[PDB]
Symmetry: D2
Amino acid sequence: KVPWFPRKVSELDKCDLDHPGFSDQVYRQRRKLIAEIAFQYKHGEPIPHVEYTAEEIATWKEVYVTLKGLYATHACREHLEGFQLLERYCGYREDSIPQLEDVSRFLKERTGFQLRPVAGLLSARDFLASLAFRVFQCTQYIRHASSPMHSPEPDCCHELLGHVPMLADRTFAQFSQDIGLASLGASDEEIEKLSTVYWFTVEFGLCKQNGELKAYGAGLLSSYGELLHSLSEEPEVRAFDPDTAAVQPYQDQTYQPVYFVSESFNDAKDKLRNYASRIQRPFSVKFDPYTLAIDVLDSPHTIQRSLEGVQDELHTLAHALSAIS
Amino acid sequence: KVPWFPRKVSELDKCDLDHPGFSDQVYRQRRKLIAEIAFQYKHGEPIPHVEYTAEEIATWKEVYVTLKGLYATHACREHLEGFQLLERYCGYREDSIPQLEDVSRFLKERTGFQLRPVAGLLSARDFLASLAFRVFQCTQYIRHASSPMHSPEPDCCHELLGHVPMLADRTFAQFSQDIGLASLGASDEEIEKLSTVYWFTVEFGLCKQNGELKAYGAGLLSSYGELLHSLSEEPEVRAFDPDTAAVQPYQDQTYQPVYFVSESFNDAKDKLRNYASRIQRPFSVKFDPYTLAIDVLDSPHTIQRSLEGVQDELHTLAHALSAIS
Amino acid sequence: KVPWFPRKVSELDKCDLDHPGFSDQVYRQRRKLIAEIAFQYKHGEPIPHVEYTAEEIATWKEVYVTLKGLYATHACREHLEGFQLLERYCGYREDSIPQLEDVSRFLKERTGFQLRPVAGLLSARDFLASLAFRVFQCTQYIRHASSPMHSPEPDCCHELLGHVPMLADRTFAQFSQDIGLASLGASDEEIEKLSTVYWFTVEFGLCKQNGELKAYGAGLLSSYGELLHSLSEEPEVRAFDPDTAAVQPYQDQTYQPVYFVSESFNDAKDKLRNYASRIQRPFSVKFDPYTLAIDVLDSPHTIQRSLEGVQDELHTLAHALSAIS
Amino acid sequence: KVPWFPRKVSELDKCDLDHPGFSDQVYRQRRKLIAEIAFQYKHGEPIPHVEYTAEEIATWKEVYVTLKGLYATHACREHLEGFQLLERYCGYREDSIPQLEDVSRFLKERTGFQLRPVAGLLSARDFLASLAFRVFQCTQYIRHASSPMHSPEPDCCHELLGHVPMLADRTFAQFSQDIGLASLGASDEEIEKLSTVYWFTVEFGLCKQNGELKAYGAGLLSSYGELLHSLSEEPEVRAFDPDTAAVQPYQDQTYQPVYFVSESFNDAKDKLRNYASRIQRPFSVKFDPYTLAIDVLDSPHTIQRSLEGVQDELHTLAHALSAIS
Ligand SMILES: [Fe+3]
Ligand SMILES: [Fe+3]
Ligand SMILES: [Fe+3]
Ligand SMILES: [Fe+3]
């Protein structure tokens, strides 16, 4: 009736001909070796390092330097600041691919997010379920060296340059987890809608900052050509509205003809939660950050229990107010 | 002026003739080997297992069975419930010493607490600083097999039977962290007072439940004889008051002549925070559970920032209320 | 530097050739008699009754029956419900003009608003200042009997049929007071902007309800012809945005060519307060409903003081939660 | 099942041989005239003035000057400050009895309390019900001039010197209303207990301030002899505890042998509300200060509705925080 959903972060352990390397056997083996890490991974273990070969490091260096050249003019400020933090503390550079375990430690200390190696495109419900615990299911393999500027699937370049930097921002990290919180136990229809909102924000969203249009969608930030086109006069840009985006069809191959612009991440977050209010449901969930668990609020008592945590917090703020006078 | 205090859980890495085994060289080497783990330990690593020798396991089995016999009549209910949870999920039993890493995982998922192997009695400020991040500095060695019923220092028996079970209770875990939060940057005088409140609660506190007196202090719960005496007609028992306890002298060797009884953990917690209000300070701290960091609240802006987290939470509770009607 | 503003509701006591009756001396005397009540009125006194002459009652009956015929199709639901409440409990009918004192008692018990007899169009700052205490400065005289369907100035018909019913709704009443709260001590420039937002909402606002467009602006609800035109294909209707409305020029004589539509009163209220955030100011005000006073929040301490009221309230909600389980 | 209780302040309109003037017919007529005002009074009307005769004014002057001499040494600070405010703004003096209507206006603007003339000792439930709306049922007649220093019943001296000044303090006013809120719809047994808590606090309570014992109970503050005895070595003084006080027997004629001392009004208020939590009830009430109504919280929806008021308020405090930086 209500599909199953994880309630503890532990439980996430239960959750082509045209491809540039389809006819490379050395590459198809590198992959199986890398997917291997995702398949044997359990919550709580340090993510195993991958020793990238010089050519892999070379594909990274091209994607990196090229996109790096567009960020100052095309990216939202959250991306620039997070990309700068990654360079300062997580060894981001053009001559070496970062290790997931070092990036995860960096995200845990900045916004509480963490990474989990994944074998390649997860089911929509499992992906959003993971976002609910501030866990980003992340690929560890690189795109075939023959087409560095273009990748069908999400590779580590797309993950580490496209997603990770925005996850270092407090407000965006909360927006992402909110989409995942909203999806827990939701119907398949509601999962597809949420996946679509996700597509038009986390993946291909645009935002307005000091009158200028800027990208924040990972699919834009890890794509040289799409990045230039998203800010051009060619696609149509609509005001972000969770309801409108949820039913906007879209496709995978070519650039997007339509994008949604949010006014601010706090505005989009507010619009996403009023949207989540209207989702048909006999309960609500609230994340418990101390234990990485999902509390189900389905009675006056469970709501009262969380309220108590909130009243303790307000007590702390009252004390801070006398302390500073 | 304000002493240094950790603001990230990472930073905790910067924080006798009469002894039953003083004249045992095999034991004095077991220790150095065990202290070794504490000294080489860094935040975030799985805590290294210790292979306990049959006799060590034998000392454990005696302390365990003996105290286990008093719990139903002498221990507070939080201890009984947590001890039961430990048996059900953390393999507590008389024939094997539990591994710190399995107990820590258990605490992380229950109350967000975690353990850290420590070499033996830490400085007061560093100990309370650690409590601020819900980190319990925990010994890993066992008491000399010659005097199983008595141990000068805190050994793993005292830690795992005395402290751990109460840390599995939501309210007590928050009380402990509160003492640590209150101690951050406090003066040496204020550290000694807080250490004393800690002594009379976490270590030797008594509480009243359904008109009956019961123990919750770890030093009582891991001590056969003291446990019986604390509930007898011999010592004096006073109503718990943070101010009164902070200046009560006490000693280490013999049983305590005076104990403090709290009415409920929520009552004691409330009394401890009004106490923390009166501590001379130009700021307050609030724990950020998503990143295991300490936020210093020293301006209208930092207070506003935390308030926003609280307002998001209240939004979640409002939504839970419509969802259940 | 910061203009003076009332801080107690008591202090409000310190705050044409073309006209249809310009050449009626009996009418010009009725007015002076009525303005008289406004000029001698002090906060806290019952508002003096006015004995309306049969013809006055006749002008009322025409305006009433005519507009009454459009409400079911043109008015927002808040107006219909409040107009129904007024009929049920405040004797609204076509054959007698209601007395301000009975309407005020009705508003006090429904939303806490109250009326105050006013002599005729107040200064912008004084008008908005009054709205801050949930006091609606209200005219008591009727429009000249020669042109019942049209009135230059706000008469009692415009006040009692146009404004009063929306003030009976909890959310709209809070929106109105918010505009007044925001105006306290604000610069003249900021008063004109707020007056303009007021013009496009309270006076001539439109709102959308179940996909249909509806009026809520008093100037629409007390105007037969404007009411029909505001919902027609003739004027331009723009999405409500406090920033855009504040600088929209407008005029007095003819119908409005442009109106703003809010999605919901809660949405408009939220948009009005984010607008009020960006108003240049070294303080904020919060209404104290127990004493009808304005608290100025200009230090950590005054903010702490109000927080305490809020924490008491949250304590009440926690108790209500256990009571209902 | 649940007795009826007012939900609107309007509804309060539905709620001896040894006596010094029993054998005075001129006095017994003065009374009937004064009781008259209470019987014909309706909520919202200005309280009718009483023209006190010179001798009445003379009894007042004696009680006033005598007690006035003990306040600096025997009264809590809230009483001294409120008595000073009354002198500064409400014409308190030894040569004229204050008018209820001027005192009520004073209380409305200070703490939101108001007075209502009452004929003489009301039923316990009706008295506490009135306290729920911050309405103090107050006598308007004076004690017989023959025994100025002693009065069986509560006269205007007892009300205006004993009660009124404490009602001018924000925290005490909230404590009093809380007792009334707690009594709404409660059983007769629960009314008697609450009446007893009221007796030992509002009427005869003692409090501790800077290590010194002080009175705040109206029955103490309007009684020369009891005032001296309550602070002497003769009666027993117990720590205030709502549970203990509720079942303490007491009598009317002689001084009290036992009193309860609260540590602070905020402490007593907190202890009174935990007491109110344990009262058997399927709902909770919350006062709506804008309309002087009682909201019954008996479902997730009604609780959600009040929560929204609280979230608006927290929004105001967030804005005040940026405004002051
Ligand atoms: Fe992606
Ligand atoms: Fe210990
Ligand atoms: Fe108007
Ligand atoms: Fe009394």
